[PDB]
Amino acid sequence: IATHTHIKGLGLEPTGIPIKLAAGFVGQLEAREAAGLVVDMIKQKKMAGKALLLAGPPGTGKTALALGISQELGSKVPFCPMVGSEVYSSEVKKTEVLMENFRRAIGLRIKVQDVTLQDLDAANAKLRQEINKVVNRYIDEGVAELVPGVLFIDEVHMLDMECFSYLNRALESSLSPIVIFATNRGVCNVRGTDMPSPHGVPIDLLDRLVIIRTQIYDPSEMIQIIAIRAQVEELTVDEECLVLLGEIGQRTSLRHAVQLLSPASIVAKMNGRDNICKADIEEVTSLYLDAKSSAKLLHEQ
Amino acid sequence: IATHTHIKGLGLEPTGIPIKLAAGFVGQLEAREAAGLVVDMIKQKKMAGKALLLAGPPGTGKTALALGISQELGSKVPFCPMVGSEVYSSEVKKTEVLMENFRRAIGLRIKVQDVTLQDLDAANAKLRQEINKVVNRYIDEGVAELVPGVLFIDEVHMLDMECFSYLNRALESSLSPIVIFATNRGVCNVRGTDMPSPHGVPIDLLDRLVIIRTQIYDPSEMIQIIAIRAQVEELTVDEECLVLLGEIGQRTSLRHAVQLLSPASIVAKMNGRDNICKADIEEVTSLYLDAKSSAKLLHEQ
Amino acid sequence: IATHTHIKGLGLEPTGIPIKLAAGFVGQLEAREAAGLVVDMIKQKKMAGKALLLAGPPGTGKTALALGISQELGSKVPFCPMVGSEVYSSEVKKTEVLMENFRRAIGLRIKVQDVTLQDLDAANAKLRQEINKVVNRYIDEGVAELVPGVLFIDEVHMLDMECFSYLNRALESSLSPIVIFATNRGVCNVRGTDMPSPHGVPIDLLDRLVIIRTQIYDPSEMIQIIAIRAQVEELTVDEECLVLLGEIGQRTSLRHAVQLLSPASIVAKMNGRDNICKADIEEVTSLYLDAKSSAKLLHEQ
Amino acid sequence: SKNIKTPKSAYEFENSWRSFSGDSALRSQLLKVTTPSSLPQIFKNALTSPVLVDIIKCVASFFTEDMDLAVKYIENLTKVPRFNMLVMCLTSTEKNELLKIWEDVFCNKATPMEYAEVLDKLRSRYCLKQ
Amino acid sequence: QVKARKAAGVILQMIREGKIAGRAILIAGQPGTGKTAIAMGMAKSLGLETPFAMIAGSEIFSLEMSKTEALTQSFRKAIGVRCVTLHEIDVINSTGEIRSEVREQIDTKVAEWREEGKAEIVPGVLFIDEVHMLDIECFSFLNRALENEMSPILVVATNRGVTTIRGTNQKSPHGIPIDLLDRLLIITTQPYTDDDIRKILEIRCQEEDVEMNEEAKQLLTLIGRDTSLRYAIHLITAAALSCQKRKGKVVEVEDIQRVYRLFLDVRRSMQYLVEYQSQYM
Amino acid sequence: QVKARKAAGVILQMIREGKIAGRAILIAGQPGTGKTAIAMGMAKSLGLETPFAMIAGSEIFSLEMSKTEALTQSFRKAIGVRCVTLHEIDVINSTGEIRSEVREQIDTKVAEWREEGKAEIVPGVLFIDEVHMLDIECFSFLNRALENEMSPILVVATNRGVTTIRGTNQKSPHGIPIDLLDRLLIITTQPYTDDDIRKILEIRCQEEDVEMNEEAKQLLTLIGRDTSLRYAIHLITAAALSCQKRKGKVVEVEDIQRVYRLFLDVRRSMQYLVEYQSQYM
Amino acid sequence: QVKARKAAGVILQMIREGKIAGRAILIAGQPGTGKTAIAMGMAKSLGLETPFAMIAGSEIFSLEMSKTEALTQSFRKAIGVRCVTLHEIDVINSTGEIRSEVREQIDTKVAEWREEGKAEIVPGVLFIDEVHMLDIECFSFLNRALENEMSPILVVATNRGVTTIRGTNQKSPHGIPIDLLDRLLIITTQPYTDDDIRKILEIRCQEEDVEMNEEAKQLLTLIGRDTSLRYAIHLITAAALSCQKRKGKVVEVEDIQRVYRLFLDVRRSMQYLVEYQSQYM
Ligand SMILES: Nc1ncnc2c1ncn2[C@@H]1O[C@H](COP(=O)(O)OP(=O)(O)O)[C@@H](O)[C@H]1O
Ligand SMILES: Nc1ncnc2c1ncn2[C@@H]1O[C@H](COP(=O)(O)OP(=O)(O)O)[C@@H](O)[C@H]1O
Numbered sequence A, B, C: 001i002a003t004h005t006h007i008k009g010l011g012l013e014p015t016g017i018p019i020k021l022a023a024g025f026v027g028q029l030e031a032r033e034a035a036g037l038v039v040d041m042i043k044q045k046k047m048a049g050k051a052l053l054l055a056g057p058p059g060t061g062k063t064a065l066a067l068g069i070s071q072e073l074g075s076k077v078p079f080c081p082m083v084g085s086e087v088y089s090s091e092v093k094k095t096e097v098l099m100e101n102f103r104r105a106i107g108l109r110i111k112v113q114d115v116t117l118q119d120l121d122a123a124n125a126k127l128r129q130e131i132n133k134v135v136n137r138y139i140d141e142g143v144a145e146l147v148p149g150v151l152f153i154d155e156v157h158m159l160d161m162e163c164f165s166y167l168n169r170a171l172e173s174s175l176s177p178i179v180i181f182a183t184n185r186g187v188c189n190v191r192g193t194d195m196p197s198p199h200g201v202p203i204d205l206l207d208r209l210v211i212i213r214t215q216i217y218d219p220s221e222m223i224q225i226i227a228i229r230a231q232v233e234e235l236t237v238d239e240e241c242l243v244l245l246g247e248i249g250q251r252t253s254l255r256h257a258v259q260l261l262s263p264a265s266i267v268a269k270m271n272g273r274d275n276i277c278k279a280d281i282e283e284v285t286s287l288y289l290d291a292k293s294s295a296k297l298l299h300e301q
Numbered sequence D: 001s002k003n004i005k006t007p008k009s010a011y012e013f014e015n016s017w018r019s020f021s022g023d024s025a026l027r028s029q030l031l032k033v034t035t036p037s038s039l040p041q042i043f044k045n046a047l048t049s050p051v052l053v054d055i056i057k058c059v060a061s062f063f064t065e066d067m068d069l070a071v072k073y074i075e076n077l078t079k080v081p082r083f084n085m086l087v088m089c090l091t092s093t094e095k096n097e098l099l100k101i102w103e104d105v106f107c108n109k110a111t112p113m114e115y116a117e118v119l120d121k122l123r124s125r126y127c128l129k130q
Numbered sequence E, F, G: 001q002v003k004a005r006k007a008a009g010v011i012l013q014m015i016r017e018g019k020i021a022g023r024a025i026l027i028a029g030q031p032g033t034g035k036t037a038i039a040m041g042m043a044k045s046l047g048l049e050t051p052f053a054m055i056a057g058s059e060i061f062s063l064e065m066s067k068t069e070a071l072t073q074s075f076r077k078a079i080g081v082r083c084v085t086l087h088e089i090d091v092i093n094s095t096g097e098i099r100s101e102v103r104e105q106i107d108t109k110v111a112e113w114r115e116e117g118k119a120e121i122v123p124g125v126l127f128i129d130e131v132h133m134l135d136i137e138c139f140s141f142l143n144r145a146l147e148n149e150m151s152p153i154l155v156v157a158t159n160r161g162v163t164t165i166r167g168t169n170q171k172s173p174h175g176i177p178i179d180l181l182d183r184l185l186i187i188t189t190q191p192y193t194d195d196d197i198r199k200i201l202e203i204r205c206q207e208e209d210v211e212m213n214e215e216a217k218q219l220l221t222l223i224g225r226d227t228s229l230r231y232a233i234h235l236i237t238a239a240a241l242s243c244q245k246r247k248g249k250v251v252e253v254e255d256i257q258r259v260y261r262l263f264l265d266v267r268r269s270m271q272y273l274v275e276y277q278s279q280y281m
């Protein structure tokens, strides 16, 4: 989460409505209000047995929304991001890494030292049910407390049918954290089978998902985002270059207009000026292409 | 074979032409005559190095014709039914399941103690040629008599080239039983290959098959079939509901109409009557759909 | 390789322009001159890191040119022909078969007697690197002398990405032989990928390939080829018989036309004629068909 | 009306023949609802000699009704596969009764010479008396 | 579900008179239409003492043990010795390996000890949920296991019409072989009606201690009819906390409108995602 | 099969003169057209003492032993010393690994006994039915084994046109690699005519002790033409049994009519079930 | 190259300022366009002390080693300690270096040296030449290994457009997962211009000790522009040997015309053989 260090929280009023600019979040009012409602649902344990899905385009603040939810849950609540491609591995079974990340998000505090549940298995190991039983005895005795973290899983369609089914049964456990899937595809066959399904998820897991929409940004909001990332990286910018950066973010993605800020500062330093100018953004945009445009130029030429 | 109890042989005249109603069989005169001719071929050891094929629609006598062939050879003669799916048991090799059924069909009597060739392997459990040569020596000595049974194999297209090759090699054995394949498929790809072939069988095995065609039934013959099945089940019926049962069999299948009889008796008992009224049949066919109508309902919405 | 027995060299003038008929070769002037220039490139150390690719239709003398090159380099410089289908072996890896032929192609003479490096690799059984160190120490002492040979790899499209990448790696070794790919496929998908490429060879290896074009033959050149091939097998043959054999060669392939000569001689020996006649070829071409005509005949039936 | 429909296949023809087997009236009118041109497409070697004799006799039932159609139908029966072995497969009883039907029905004085010549030309190759 | 429950009752009478033999039951229909409720209802209606086992789906092909071992253990789970099941006897005598001695010992015991309250046996109702995922290997094992004496009453569930059999190319109804389908009494579950949706939402309101007026109830019934029952059930909790944020005593129609605006359903989000992906990519 | 037998005789005269060299034979024609008869006659005409080995293309996938092990056993079976084959020497000195010491023992012992003018090595014939079923590894092993000086004459056989080489994507004639196909003398076997069918059915009727009039014989010849010969061979036995049930002394056209009506050929049964499947969907 | 080298300089200043954490570099131009040259230029411009770990995507899948073993070996080889790499440290303390406990020991011991300041650490440059050939497991391993603070600077190279990742059916740019593409700084290398081709051919001539007049040099530049630079580099050697054979000294235009007539470029031979393969079909 090196790229969302500015996300302090959802930025909600006492009444639950989001503020237009607060806690690092600028825009995206519907999804922020929905995330606030879901946070209130986690706080009183009404989401036990369900999970969250963020359905929206790329560079739409889904990972920022999950980080805001995890920050809003508590002070040092853990946040485990991962990708579906990470589940496949040559050295460990896919199910094993799935439970590894799943249990890594279950934080506990013992009266005061804080540690994640997967560290207990890593030290004591496979034998996870016994670890669950002893931490249940600990928290029932009151000497320790549990905090459910946030297991964020981007590219949910990449997960296999075995992965989806195992997550469906594994959500039944009382100690489990909130699992936040994220997707941008829609129609996609479930990996490992030929049946189409919404968002590449089977029906048996889609039964228990609470969906939230995230909407694309207008240019002004995107320019505000690039400005916020400019201040957080200790860079200096102006409207003449920020407008071009916003156009570049619109035409490719906000994840490629926020990656270009640092080399713009570097090429500005090579040009002998400490402040980024429009020529710097033109130069770095000419040099470094996005993945889609780069592949397009590769296959066309 | 909980069903097929009413069948007690082909029920033929001494001249060999079948009787229109005898030994449980209704109609099906051409296939019954051919089955009697194959029985006479088996009696004179002429079917060695050959197999039988019953090609026809589902619910047209085929499994019942094989049982008639097995019954006509003698009361002690066994009948081993199986399906093509049954070979794919994971715990035991497919060729082993094939040869196990192959040896289960082979009957012997030691003089009297009636044993299959599978039991002699189980008591002396592979090592196949030892028991084969031993029983050859026994029947040459006259201490034992060989009665080959009927290895019936429905859904023959599900078998693969390894299974068909093993069957083709195993038919060369002198002590083999009569392999009655049964099929309801025309041109089909042999499993494990790509090329279509007749009945999903390779040409090499088709160069030794005696093929018999089984015709589908009229409404009258189907009504007689359901009447026989109802009488053998100790169910009391009338012609009024039997016409409806014949209609249901003609619309979906004969097997479905036969299987609806027991819940019809239960629904009649629920309504305080022993006789199966027409309304009972309407209730049961409204409740229990056949596979095809159920799949048509599931395909919608 | 008894078919190429008549070839003894490229048959070039001192100026390097080919002779029309010399050293068993007839015609094929452009590819002969190109192979002569490649031989002169091989006499100096300028061929290092490169390979040759004979691209042309079948029966145009690609293997003939490879054997001519291997004869031209030295007195008995070794020639190790193979095909791509030879690489796929169940007993040993594809890479192992590749290295086996690759090291069989290398020759070493020691003060004097000659031996292949495969003999050292197998008898004195890390093995490749250790024996390469031993041979490098031996040749640097000025007591062993290297005669590199020719690894002729017919049907290059039959190989896959692993084999091509491994050959690209192994060509950079100092003691490598002159790998001569041969192909008759225009554009083909490299096995293991869905990328069309020229000649079934990947782009990474195609850079280091000197390509030679071989031409289809005039009728008179095919006549002369069949004449010399019949003469070397100690057959006498009529002119009109040669015309019929050349017509058969243009019809199907030159390989079939040369292979028909022995059965033509046997058919002529029957009926007591030492000289082969036209009716013998009219009989033999009817008796034995080529592969394409036979496949067409089977597909008609 | 709905009981007598066009068969799409030899399966359909044989299953219509079985149901209508005992009643000739629904067999003599069966041949009217089908085109004889489709007959060699309907039968794709699925035609036995008793069925051939039955169909010829049924065409004889309505020979005089539509004589051209009869001499079309029998002609179209010549276009079925395995016809030669089929007529070779006839037993002596069917051969004799076909000869009787020839002298009675298909070679009566009522028919004109135009249809009679074609019928006798076909009957030279059906019966194969020798 | 009235027709499906009546069919379950008729099958239960077939079980009680013993006329069902070498036969299984299938419960078809759209997903989430209370199929497991029918299965457990039949199992309890036979008797609370009788065992039950819901094992199957894609749960098989993911456990540490093989598919055949899991199927064997679940099959032995659904045979109650009176209560203790045969699988419990296997765990006491211990996955590891399954010992064949137990069948001989318990056969001797039921031959000897019966009508004493020691070693009598009742057959349970096995339930194989989502059977279309099972391989042809699993169906062959099912055929070999059903023919054994003292087997459980097999029940299977499916929510697909015609599929490829897992492990072969040939298609079939419900992803089951024809030799199985010629023995299955197929119960079909109809979709929920308006009076069923309203009653289910009222039961969930009573369970979760949520009060809401009749306008909200009717609009939520309409939403559940149009969209999904589980979506409406999620809306109950979400609107309850939305009203709690306003310090309200009773959930109002504005809470349902707000939460329907916020939390999308599957179909609406599917529409809004394809409306991005088809055009912008 | 006159032209094919003539070509086989030409290859026999080739083999006697040693002109076959590294080449082999392919028998390419429709199934059941005297392939194995041609190969066995070839091996006999080489000499009655000559060894012979036979194998089907699918037999190597029996799974008792690997593909190459079965091919090695088949190759060793088709070599002799005189008598004993090298497979028999392997069995005497035994499956295990075929150690190279047995080849050295064979070389030294046969050289010593050839010096004494008492025994010599003989190459035999190996026949491979259904060569299109062979894998590409099996073809590579075939080339490797034929490279050996002790190798026997190979006679592959196919009943397939252009098809994919099994285990690869390349389409080649007969499902064989090209590099083998440039060195195969392809003998083609023509389909049987009326007179050949009549002679074969006459010989089979003589063998079966069945007597038939000329009308039934001609009708059966027509059946054999239009429905292949093997179906007529089956009909001979079926009609003999029908005549026996009729208490006759000769099988007539009535019996052939009955048996043709009853027992279908592959074409009519395939047509009947294709027509059903067309109706059914 | 001009723009690509300037981009490499900007990235060089970025790594030198310690701003690369959580990123990698992608060089996504056409093949044979100085990808590896830019890689070694980056490694040299950081410093001669910094190690450079070359690897290509096809090499890891050799059967002597696993994909993860080759990847972790190349990963550890790119990290220098002072001069010695971590793979050399494993060789000293002990792919072949398959040893996990002493990997933990090495990590702990170099960690205490790093904290104590007795021996510093320098991250190098890990170049992966054919990253599109890496499987999804390989990409997952790379994503995991980059998270370590001890990781090197990752550079990947490819010449594929949009394609499907190996081991998956999903299409993406360059056969890389999106989660890695979102971090990669994508350099693109332009094709060589006429002046660049002329210059490169001049240095290749002077290195080869080959003399040409200006007309031959400009014709060879035209040949390189039309077909390929590497083909022209082959023609330099071929024309030099052709002139040496004719007893000339300076390589003339006629020698280049002869060599172009003899040796075919890839596209010309491909077209000539495609004509035959289309004709013979
Ligand atoms: N509403 C927002 N407020 C602040 N930053 C945002 C917002 N939406 C997106 N971003 C920024 O977008 C960048 C890329 O992350 P994100 O857009 O969340 O990726 P994705 O949507 O693919 O998960 C981050 O710097 C993130 O903080
Ligand atoms: N000739 C017959 N007489 C009586 N019942 C029959 C007859 N033929 C079939 N049946 C009934 O039809 C049912 C289904 O057909 P079956 O004999 O199993 O053939 P198939 O294998 O084609 O399904 C059987 O259970 C049997 O009761």
Ligand SMILES: Nc1ncnc2c1ncn2[C@@H]1O[C@H](COP(=O)(O)OP(=O)(O)O)[C@@H](O)[C@H]1O
Residues within 6 Å of the ligand: C003, C004, C024, C025, C026, C027, C028, C057, C058, C059, C060, C061, C062, C063, C064, C154, C182, C225, C229, C254, C255, C258
């Ligand atoms: N230029 C030539 N001069 C004389 N004989 C030739 C020439 N080219 C080919 N042949 C003969 O024709 C045959 C054709 O095979 P060949 O062309 O070598 O196969 P490939 O093209 O696969 O290498 C060879 O066996 C050789 O004897």
